[PDB]
Design a binder for this molecule. Structure first.
Ligand SMILES: O=C(O)c1cc(C(=O)O)c2c(n1)C(=O)C(=O)c1cc(C(=O)O)[nH]c1-2
Ligand SMILES: [Ca+2]
Length: 661
């Protein structure tokens, strides 16, 4: 339970996630999680940037500093690079956001862990056709067949959740149209009374134009413009298909075992806005990336519920996650006469086989020291080996083959005292560890060929106190944390969508996370939350001035959410949500700043139940007051193209037609 979790945890229920929502972006529904900053870039190539307590704000694409599991399959790779685009919002049961590295039961992460579980098929079988049309020619439809052959408690009882969605959009920005085909199957079969097998299949094909960032003047003059995106035809194709086998068994009344194996393949092509000039350097990797990532893994854990002086539940396991990378880079241009025609795959400029695999023994323990006092104490020993074998050796571009090994002990602990049956205080300490991604190692600020292997991994020590109190039909959670990070990986510079990274010697985050979910008499929901986050450099990361003490860019000091929704089981329902985002620094120097903004969204729908049929029609207006703001920044953009403008007042209408057999 959230209240019983001795750490900052938020659980966003899938149905609330789908309540009058487009079901396109996680930002639609995770906005109410304190300490979780979800930057919508209006860009399905780089996609949503998720940060937990400031960790991940450096991510120029996908997510970093957050370990994301989608139905047990890591969306975060052994190099720490993650993607949220494969999450099927239409089929999510719930999203668990764990803030802080306070559990050894998840891989290393500086910020936290996000677990997305797909709905388990239940009775009655249901086929749900969902559709949604929103501003900018946004159109997401989908079919979800979710059912089961029994209660799931008998051998051979099968549950299934098959869900396919097609999303298309012209995009708010110029050159930001995107198409995402998503398929997501969660099958389960009870082998016998003791065991349960679960198949996960996930597939996502994306073709998204990349609008890029705008300078302040560009954003002010025309927020929709994407001039570099037009010139370079910056765009991204993704094709990721993963499968997962989760075998759970009960070996005894006190013992359980769980083996989660997975294997997926992600094919990426990304045309970037790097001009020809830098690519004329033989050491340059070009302006187009083609990536073929084959990831597999097996996490085998044993949970024993015994007593050593006091009751103690320990989950000890071994996690293996391997990823191979066939990574190629081409010129993003071909020369017509003497002029580069961009948006084209040119001459090969990079060709390497990278291999990043981590092996982590881990042991989590939960001692009931007293009736009210409990102690989590876990340690994960993460050993990560990276090996780049460079196949691109030309004059001025030598053998860039290298390797690295990071071996980190990650202890976490938590003392939780039950003030009352409804009020728990907790004090959690934890060590987080973040290796640089392969892409973060790929590029040197000095422009020479070879990986930036001087990029050290970051290690963060997080202390946190917290208090969760049930205030009726709801939870009030307060968390106060300090995270001191050594060698924090930060964006050094970004140009044309390509980012070099460096290590900030010392950073400090001090934050408070208040959350309040409450259901009132009469189908009323109130979800409030406030995040305060002082994320500062404790060392100078700037090459030209003292930025020591400056706010870390990409991180809002304050975020706020307040949604009130009248959502009865059927009939007319409605809701409104105010989302405050504090201003965000776009550079280490704290000279470029995305202004703070308040976004008021409204929605109203009608659910009609006619025996086996449910028709949920709804209309929503996001950014009700038409606030001009920037939904995401590109930190340390070398040309000051920090700003990813957000739409303005926009609308959507959705229909969810469910038939229960
Ligand atoms: O979705 C992906 O798998 C993926 C991979 C990569 C990569 O590893 O090169 C990039 C991106 N996306 C991306 O969106 C992006 O803007 C980007 C820039 C670069 C680079 O090498 O400069 N890689 C990538
Ligand atoms: Ca080389």
């Amino acid at each position: 339970s959230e209240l019983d979790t001795p750490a900052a945890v938020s659980v966003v229920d899938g149905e609330e996630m789908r309540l009058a929502t487009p079901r396109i972006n996680l930002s639609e529904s995770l906005t109410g999680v304190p300490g979780l900053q979800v930057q919508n870039r209006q860009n399905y190539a780089q996609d949503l940037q998720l940060s937990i307590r400031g960790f991940g704000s450096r991510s120029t694409y996908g997510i970093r500093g957050i370990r994301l599991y989608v139905d047990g399959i890591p969306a975060t790779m052994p190099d720490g690079q993650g993607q949220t685009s494969n999450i099927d919002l239409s089929s999510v049961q719930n999203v668990e956001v764990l803030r802080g590295p306070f559990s050894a039961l998840y891989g290393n992460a500086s910020g936290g862990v996000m677990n997305v579980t797909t709905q388990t098929g239940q009775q009655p079988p249901t086929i749900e056709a969902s559709s949604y049309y929103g501003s900018f020619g946004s159109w997401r439809y989908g079919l979800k067949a979710t059912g089961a052959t029994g209660d799931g408690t008998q051998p051979g009882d099968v549950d299934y959740t098959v869900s396919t969605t097609r999303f298309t959009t012209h995009g708010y920005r110029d050159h930001s149209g995107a198409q995402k085909n998503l398929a997501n199957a969660k099958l389960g079969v009870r082998i016998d009374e003791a065991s349960k097998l679960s198949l996960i299949f996930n597939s996502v094909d994306i073709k998204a134009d990349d609008p890029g960032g705008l300078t302040k003047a560009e954003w002010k003059a025309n927020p929709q413009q994407a001039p570099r995106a037009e010139q370079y035809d910056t765009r991204k194709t993704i094709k990721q298909t993963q499968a997962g086998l989760r075998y759970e068994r009960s070996l005894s009344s006190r013992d359980d075992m769980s083996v989660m194996m997975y294997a997926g393949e992600r094919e990426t092509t990304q045309y970037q806005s790097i001009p020809m000039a830098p690519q004329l350097n033989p050491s340059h990797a070009g302006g187009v990336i083609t990536l073929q990532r084959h990831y597999q893994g097996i996490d085998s854990r044993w949970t024993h519920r015994g007593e050593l002086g006091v009751p103690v539940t320990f989950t000890t396991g071994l996690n293996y996650e391997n990823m191979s990378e066939n990574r190629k880079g081409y010129n993003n241009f071909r020369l017509n006469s003497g002029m580069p025609e961009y948006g084209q795959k040119g001459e090969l400029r990079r060709d390497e086989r990278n291999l990043m695999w981590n092996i982590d023994p881990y042991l989590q323990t939960q001692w009931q020291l007293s009736e009210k006092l409990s102690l989590d104490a876990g340690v994960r020993y993460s050993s990560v080996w990276f090996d780049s074998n460079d196949h691109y050796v030309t004059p001025g571009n030598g053998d860039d083959s290298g390797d690295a090994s990071y071996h980190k002990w990650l202890p976490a602990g938590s003392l939780k005292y039950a003030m009352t049956d409804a009020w728990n205080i907790y004090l959690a300490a934890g060590r987080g560890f973040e290796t640089p991604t392969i892409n973060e190692l790929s590029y040197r600020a000095d422009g020479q060929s070879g990986m930036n292997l001087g990029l050290k991994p970051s290690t963060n020590d997080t202390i946190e106190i917290g208090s969760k109190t049930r205030i009726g039909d709801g939870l009030l959670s307060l968390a106060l944390f300090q995270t001191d990070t050594d060698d924090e990986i930060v964006v050094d510079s970004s140009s044309g969508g390509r980012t070099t990274y460096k290590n900030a010697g010392k950073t400090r985050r001090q934050g408070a996370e208040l959350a309040w979910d409450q259901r009132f008499a009469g189908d009323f929901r109130v979800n409030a939350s406030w995040t305060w986050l002082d994320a500062t450099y404790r060392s100078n990361v700037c090459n030209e001035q003292d930025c020591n003490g400056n706010r870390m860019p990409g991180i809002a000091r304050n975020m706020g959410f307040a949604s009130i929704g009248y959502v009865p089981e059927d009939g007319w329902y409605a809701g409104t949500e105010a989302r405050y985002m504090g201003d965000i620094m776009a550079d280490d120097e704290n000279t470029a700043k995305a202004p703070s903004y308040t976004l008021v969204g409204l929605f109203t729908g009608y659910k009609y139940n006619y025996h086996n049929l449910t028709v949920d029609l709804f209309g929503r207006v996001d950014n009700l007051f038409d606030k001009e703001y920037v939904g995401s920044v590109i930190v340390n953009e070398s040309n000051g193209r920090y700003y990813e403008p957000s739409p303005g007042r926009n609308y959507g209408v959705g229909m969810n037609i469910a038939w229960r057999f």
